[PDB]
């Protein structure tokens, strides 16, 4: 099974640096050129370089937008691909994933990035990291109930929200942060049977990685 | 450098529906020794990686449901999608990898439904917020369609403008309703200055406002 985790991302003060990794198994990494594509907040993907395989002498390729800036790099030994970013501007604010690019010298050779990881996000910016606080959103006064959590107050994005550790999925929305004064706020709701709470526990699980932070808060009736 | 663009940027289309979206790329993707055009077609699902469907503009992805044919040639290409399901939500993007790699702007297809009244829940501030002195009152409209409404708050009958965040999910793949956020925020001193708090949902389901609110002397 083809498996790529991107890892290193996080806040980064601007014209610093950051080095993201790319973890990968379940092929003959050396075989493959790989590439890393990165997507800012509600825009387009943006492809910003790639390294060749083995036979190609694992030689290097950048975008305009990135040339000069960044170096893409690969360890043959513990199969990863890497990153180094420098000169950091808010526009490389984005999340950035590794994809497994082409091997042109294989029988079943076809041209695309078929395989890509889930993505790391990198947030350039000035601002200083602040955990969530997060809050119970229970009823004060039929069928279907909901609750909530508030996560508000944190910086940078991202966080995530479970509820009970991910065995409540269905009649879940969490939505989109939003931004005020350097400040993140985000809510999610989850809809359960009335029968089912208080009767049932619900309890929603919030992590803040750039500051660590991890929170289980039951929704207790009041 | 090629440049790569699409059309629509946007469009919406009910279940079962066919949908056709274009690719252009400035140069031609054509090699004419091997007869290949490298343009390729990804798929992003709300809050998931891209997904590969189409590579050599027109070959489908193993797994990659024949409802979607990828066609074209030379420097015009195009994506069409027969009987669209629900879960098709997404952005579509086209992409050229004959010199090096570039990522078209992307197409947001979104699915047309029945119009759907918003299900609304109001919650009063936690008394661990308000124990750090601030107050936060949260109002949840669930699972309407269209997209199209507005929030109004009202502090005992009058509208409070400021202090207001909204936040909207994108289209569910499987219901394809839409779902809002909207959260007061007030300090401690100012929740406490007041009695009814009040969100009101204008949605086109429904000529008078939806209301759910609480009084703080409850
Ligand atoms: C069928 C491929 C023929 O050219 C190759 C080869 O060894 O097969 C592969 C070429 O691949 C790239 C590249 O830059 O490495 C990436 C491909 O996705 C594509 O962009 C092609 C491009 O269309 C070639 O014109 O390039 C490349 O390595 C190539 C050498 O540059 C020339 O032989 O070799
Ligand atoms: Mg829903
Ligand atoms: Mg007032
Ligand atoms: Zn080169």
């Known amino acids: 099974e083809v498996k790529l985790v991107e890892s290193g991302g996080g806040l980064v003060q601007s014209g610093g640096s950051l080095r993201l990794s790319c973890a990968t198994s379940?092929?003959?990494?050396?075989?493959?050129?790989m590439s890393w594509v990165r997507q800012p907040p509600g825009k387009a993907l943006e492809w910003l370089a790639f390294?060749?395989?083995?036979?190609?002498?694992?030689?290097?390729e950048y975008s305009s937008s990135v040339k000069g800036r960044f170096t893409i790099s690969r360890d043959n030994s513990q199969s990863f691909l890497y990153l180094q970013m420098n000169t950091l501007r808010a526009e490389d604010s984005a999340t950035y994933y590794c994809?497994?690019?082409?091997?042109?010298?294989?029988?079943?050779?076809?041209?695309?990035?078929?395989?890509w990881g889930q993505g790391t996000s990198v947030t350039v910016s000035r601002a200083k990291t602040t955990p969530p606080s997060v809050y119970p959103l229970a009823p004060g006064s039929n069928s279907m109930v909901t609750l909530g959590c508030l996560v508000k107050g944190y910086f940078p994005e991202p966080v995530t929200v479970t509820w009970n550790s991910g065995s409540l999925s269905s009649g879940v929305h969490t939505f989109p942060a939003v931004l005020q004064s350097d400040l993140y706020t985000l809510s999610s709701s989850v809809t359960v049977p009335s029968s089912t709470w208080p009767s049932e526990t619900v309890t929603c699980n919030v992590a803040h990685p750039a500051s660590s932070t991890k929170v289980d808060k039951k929704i207790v009736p009041r | 450098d090629i440049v790569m663009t699409q059309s629509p940027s946007s469009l919406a289309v009910s279940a079962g529906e066919k949908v056709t979206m274009s690719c252009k790329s400035s140069?031609?993707?054509?090699?004419?020794?091997?007869?290949?055009?490298?343009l390729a077609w990804y798929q992003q699902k709300p809050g998931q990686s891209p997904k590969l469907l189409i590579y050599?503009?027109?070959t489908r992805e193993s797994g990659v449901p024949d409802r979607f044919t990828g066609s074209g040639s030379g420097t015009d290409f195009t994506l069409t999608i027969s009987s669209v399901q629900a879960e098709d939500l997404a952005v579509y993007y086209c992409?050229?990898?004959?010199?090096?790699?570039?990522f078209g702007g992307g197409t947001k297809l979104e699915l047309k439904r029945a119009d759907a009244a918003p299900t609304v829940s109001i919650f009063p501030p936690s008394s661990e917020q308000l124990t750090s002195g601030g107050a936060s009152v949260v109002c949840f409209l669930n699972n309407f369609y269209p997209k199209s409404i507005a929030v109004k708050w009202k502090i005992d009958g009058s509208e409070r403008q400021n202090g207001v965040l909204n936040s909207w999910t994108d289209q569910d793949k499987k219901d394809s309703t839409y779902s809002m956020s909207s959260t007061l925020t007030l300090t401690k001193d100012e929740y406490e200055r007041h009695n009814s708090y009040t969100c009101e949902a204008t949605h086109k389901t429904s000529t008078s406002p939806i209301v759910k609110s609480f009084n703080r002397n409850e």
């Open positions: 994809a497994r690019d082409i091997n042109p010298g294989s029988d079943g050779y076809y041209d695309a990035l078929d395989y």
């Open positions: 390294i060749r395989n083995k036979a190609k002498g694992y030689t290097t």
């Open positions: 992409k050229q990898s004959y010199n090096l790699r570039t």
């Open positions: 050599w503009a027109s």
């Open positions: 140069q031609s993707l054509l090699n004419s020794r091997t007869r290949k055009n490298y």
């Open positions: 379940g092929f003959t990494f050396t075989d493959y050129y």
